[PDB]
Amino acid sequence: SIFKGSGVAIITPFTNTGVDFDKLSELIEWHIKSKTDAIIVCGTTGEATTMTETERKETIKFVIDKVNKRIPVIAGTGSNNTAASIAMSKWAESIGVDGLLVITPYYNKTTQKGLVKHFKAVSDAVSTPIIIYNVPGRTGLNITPGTLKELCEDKNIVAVKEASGNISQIAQIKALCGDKLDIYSGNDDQIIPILALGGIGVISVLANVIPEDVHNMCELYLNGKVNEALKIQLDSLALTNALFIETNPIPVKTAMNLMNMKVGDLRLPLCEMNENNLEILKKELKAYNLM
Amino acid sequence: SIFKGSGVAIITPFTNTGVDFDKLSELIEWHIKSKTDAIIVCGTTGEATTMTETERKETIKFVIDKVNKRIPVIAGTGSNNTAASIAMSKWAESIGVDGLLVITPYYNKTTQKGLVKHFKAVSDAVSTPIIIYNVPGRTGLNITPGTLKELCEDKNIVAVKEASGNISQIAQIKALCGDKLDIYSGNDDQIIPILALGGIGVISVLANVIPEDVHNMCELYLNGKVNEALKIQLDSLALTNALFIETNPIPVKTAMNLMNMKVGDLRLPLCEMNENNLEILKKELKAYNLM
Amino acid sequence: SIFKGSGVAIITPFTNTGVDFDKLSELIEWHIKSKTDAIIVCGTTGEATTMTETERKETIKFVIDKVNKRIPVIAGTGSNNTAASIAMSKWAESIGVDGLLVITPYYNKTTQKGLVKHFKAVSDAVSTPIIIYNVPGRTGLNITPGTLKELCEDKNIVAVKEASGNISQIAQIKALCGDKLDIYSGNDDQIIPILALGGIGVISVLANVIPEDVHNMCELYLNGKVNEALKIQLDSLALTNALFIETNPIPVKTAMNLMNMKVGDLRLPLCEMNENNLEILKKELKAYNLM
Amino acid sequence: SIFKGSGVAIITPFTNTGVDFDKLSELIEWHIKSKTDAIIVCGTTGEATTMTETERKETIKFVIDKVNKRIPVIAGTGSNNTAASIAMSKWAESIGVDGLLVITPYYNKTTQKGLVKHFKAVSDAVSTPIIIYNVPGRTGLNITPGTLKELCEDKNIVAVKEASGNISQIAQIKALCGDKLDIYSGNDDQIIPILALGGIGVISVLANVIPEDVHNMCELYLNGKVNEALKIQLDSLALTNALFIETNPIPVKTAMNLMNMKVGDLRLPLCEMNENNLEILKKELKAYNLM
Query: Torsions phi, psi of C100, nearest 5?
Result: -120, 130
A195 to chain B: closest CA residue = B193
> How far, in Å, CA of B112 to CA of C274, rounded?
10
Residue C42: closest CA among C29, C30, C53: C53
Residue B222 CB burial class (10 angstroms; 0-12, 13-18, ≥19) = middle
Please tell me the experimental approach by which this structure was elucidated. X-ray
Using CA atoms, how far residue A201 sits from A149, A178, B136, B199, in Å, is: 20, 15, 30, 21
**Count of CB atoms situated within 10 Å of the CB of B278:** 18
| Largest Cα span, chain B | 49
Residue C169: closest CA among C143, C140, C192: C143
Which distant-in-sequence residues (6+ apart) come within 8 Å of D225 by Cβ? none
Using CA atoms, how far residue B240 sits from A45, A263, B138, B243, B287, in Å, is: 36, 48, 18, 5, 12
Residue C64 near residue C96, CB atoms below 8 Å: yes
Q: Which string of DSSP letters, residue by residue, matches B233-273?
A: HHHTHHHHHHTTSSSTTHHHHHHHHHTT----PPPTT--PP
Query: C10: number of CA atoms within 13 Å, CB side?
Result: 32
- Interface contact D117-A80, CB threshold 8 A: no
Residue A279 CB burial class (10 angstroms; 0-12, 13-18, ≥19) = exposed
**Count of CB atoms situated within 10 Å of the CB of A261:** 18
C190 to chain D: closest CA residue = D168
CB-CB neighbors (< 8 A) of D165 in chain C:
166-168
Residue D159 near residue D182, CB atoms below 8 Å: yes
| 3-state SS assignment for residue C130 | strand
Using CA atoms, how far residue C139 sits from B101, C80, C151, C168, D167, in Å, is: 20, 9, 19, 20, 21
- Interface contact D237-C193, CB threshold 8 A: no
CA B45 to chain centre: 7
> How far, in Å, CA of A44 to CA of A63, rounded?
16
- Give the best residue of D56, D79, D102, D109 to mutate against chain A (max A CB count within 10 A): D109
CB-CB neighbors (< 8 A) of D194 in chain C:
193
Q: Does D287 touch chain C (CB under 8 A)?
A: no
Which residues of C are catalytic, by number? 133, 161
Question: In terms of DSSP bridges, do strands B201-204 and C5-9 run parallel, antiparallel, or are they unpaired?
Answer: unpaired
- Interface contact D175-C226, CB threshold 8 A: no
> How far, in Å, CA of B115 to CA of A245, rounded?
25
Could you tell me the sign of the dihedral formed by the alpha carbons of A244, B163, C248, B76, in that order?
negative
- Measured between CB atoms, which of A115, A250, A268 is closest to D82? A268
Name residues 121-180 of chain B within 8 A of C (Cβ): 121, 136-140
Question: In terms of DSSP bridges, do strands A201-204 and A182-185 run parallel, antiparallel, or are they unpaired?
Answer: parallel
Using CA atoms, how far residue C102 sits from B86, C111, C134, in Å, is: 27, 17, 9
Which distant-in-sequence residues (6+ apart) come within 8 Å of C19 by Cβ? C12, C13, C51, C55, C58, C59, C62
Residue B152 near residue B181, CB atoms below 8 Å: yes
Which distant-in-sequence residues (6+ apart) come within 8 Å of C285 by Cβ? C239, C242, C255, C258, C259, C291
- Measured between CB atoms, which of A82, A111, A269 is closest to D105? A269
Q: Hey, which residues does D160 pair with through a beta bridge?
A: D132, D183
Using CA atoms, how far residue D105 sits from B148, D87, D123, D151, in Å, is: 36, 15, 15, 15
> How far, in Å, CA of D164 to CA of D185, rounded?
9
Element (H, E) at A82: helix A82-94
Which residues of B are catalytic, by number? 133, 161
> How far, in Å, CA of B16 to CA of A286, rounded?
64
Residue D249: closest CA among D232, D265, D234: D265
Amino acid letter, residue B219: E
Amino acid letter, residue A215: H
Name residues 82-111 of chain C within 8 A of B (Cβ): 82-83, 103, 105-111
**Count of CB atoms situated within 10 Å of the CB of C124:** 12
> How far, in Å, CA of C283 to CA of A202, rounded?
48
Question: In terms of DSSP bridges, do strands D73-76 and D38-41 run parallel, antiparallel, or are they unpaired?
Answer: parallel
- Interface contact C110-B138, CB threshold 8 A: no
Q: What is the CATH number of the domain that holds D20?
A: 3.20.20.70
Contact: chain A with chain B (3+ CB pairs below 8 Å): yes
> How far, in Å, CA of B54 to CA of D275, rounded?
54
Q: Which string of DSSP letters, residue by residue, matches B77-116?
A: ---SSHHHHHHHHHHHHHTT-SEEEEEPP-SS---HHHHH
Number of compact structural domains in chain D: 1
| Largest Cα span, chain D | 49
Amino acid letter, residue D144: T
> How far, in Å, CA of A26 to CA of A11, rounded?
12
- Interface contact D81-A138, CB threshold 8 A: no
Residue A192 near residue A233, CB atoms below 8 Å: yes
> How far, in Å, CA of D244 to CA of D282, rounded?
13
Q: What is the CA radius of gyration of chain D?
A: 18
Using CA atoms, how far residue C222 sits from B270, C74, C218, D216, in Å, is: 39, 22, 6, 21
Contact: chain B with chain D (3+ CB pairs below 8 Å): no
CB-CB neighbors (< 8 A) of A106 in chain D:
106-107, 138, 140
User: What's the reported resolution, in angstroms, to a tenth?
Assistant: 1.2
By residue range, what is the domain housing residue D58?
Answer: 1-291
Which distant-in-sequence residues (6+ apart) come within 8 Å of B231 by Cβ? none
- Interface contact A198-B230, CB threshold 8 A: yes
> How far, in Å, CA of C107 to CA of D113, rounded?
39
> How far, in Å, CA of C184 to CA of C72, rounded?
15
Which residues of D are catalytic, by number? 133, 161
- Measured between CB atoms, which of B103, B109, B113 is closest to C138? B109
Which residues of A are catalytic, by number? 133, 161
Residue B51: closest CA among C106, C108, C53, C50: C108
Query: Torsions phi, psi of C101, nearest 5?
Result: -100, 115
Which distant-in-sequence residues (6+ apart) come within 8 Å of B254 by Cβ? B272, B273, B278, B281
User: A269 to chain D nearest CA, in Å?
Assistant: 5
Residue C27 near residue C61, CB atoms below 8 Å: no
> How far, in Å, CA of C4 to CA of A136, rounded?
43
Size of interface A-B (CB pairs under 8 A): 75
Contact: chain B with chain C (3+ CB pairs below 8 Å): yes
Element (H, E) at A100: strand A99-103
- Give the best residue of B168, B191, B233 to mutate against chain A (max A CB count within 10 A): B168
Residue C160 near residue C179, CB atoms below 8 Å: no
- Give the best residue of A197, A220, A223 to mutate against chain B (max B CB count within 10 A): A197
Chain length of chain B: 291
Please confirm whether the linkage preceding B193 is cis (ω < 30° from 0).
no
Residue D139 near residue D115, CB atoms below 8 Å: no
